[PDB]
């Protein structure tokens, strides 16, 4: 009513002489604001994400950007809407978020990894994931873990680099967990269409933004592991 949609868009840098601290403490409000879909529908539709992707990469405000991206795709299906835009919208998302996992922030890998835990259901997210380096920027997280380095495991004993370094791999395996459940149904589409060939199959394929990862490791991800036995 008082225009808090329009209040908060001025508070982020637009070719402007701003500080860092008021901007980072504005997104912290805005991350509490992006929980509601009626707010969250209008944020993207009035171009707030391209406004939010105006930060030069060395910045202290990178943590609040990742929180506004994480609660963007928390419960509302806003990532369905991010597709139909100019082509380099998600190409700016893949450029910035994978840099932020590469940035190796103390909690930037605690949120930007969680963003890939759900958004792998959209196929173009995985498509831009593989035109870039992909798992070479993912395995380099696990291979640099100092809790795994047996040659240097008796080096660091302070609890700052222990509880944070035994959590970082935990979200990384879950980043792997929904990665392979997705690629199981991808190759199952490359099985049920290339092998069946209208024998129990319908060749209609628009490449849509659509959630088809089968979403149940209790029943059907278990079941999709069985029908790959009939392959080549």
């Amino acid at each position: 009513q008082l225009g808090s949609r329009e209040l908060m868009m001025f508070y982020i840098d637009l070719k402007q002489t701003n500080d860092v601290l008021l901007t980072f403490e504005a997104l912290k409000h805005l991350a509490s604001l992006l929980l509601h879909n009626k707010f969250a529908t209008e944020f993207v539709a009035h171009g707030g994400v391209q406004k939010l992707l105006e930060i030069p990469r060395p910045s202290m405000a990178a943590t609040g950007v990742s929180m506004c991206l994480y609660y963007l795709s928390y419960n509302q299906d806003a990532m369905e809407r991010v597709c139909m835009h100019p082509h380099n919208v998600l190409s700016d998302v893949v450029n910035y978020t994978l840099w932020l996992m590469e940035c190796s922030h103390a909690s930037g890998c605690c949120h930007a990894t969680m963003f890939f835990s759900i958004c792998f259901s959209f196929r173009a997210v995985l498509e831009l994931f593989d035109r870039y380096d992909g798992l070479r920027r993912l395995v380099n997280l696990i291979s640099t873990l100092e809790i795994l380095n047996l040659e240097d495991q008796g080096a660091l004993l302070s609890d700052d680099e222990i509880f944070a370094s035994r959590q970082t791999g935990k979200h990384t395996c879950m980043a792997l967990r929904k990665y392979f459940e997705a690629h199981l149904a991808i190759k199952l589409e490359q099985v049920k269409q290339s092998l069946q060939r209208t024998e129990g199959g319908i060749l209609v394929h628009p490449q849509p933004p659509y959630k088809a990862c089968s979403y149940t490791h209790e029943q059907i991800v278990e079941m999709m592991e069985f029908l790959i036995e009939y392959g080549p």
């Binding site: 199952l188 199959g201 319908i202 209609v204 088809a212 089968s214 059907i220 079941m223 029908l227």
Partner: peptide, 9 residues
């Protein structure tokens, strides 16, 4: 048309 329960066996 568009038999979309085809993935479930």
């Amino acid at each position: 048309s568009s038999k979309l329960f085809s993935s479930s066996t």
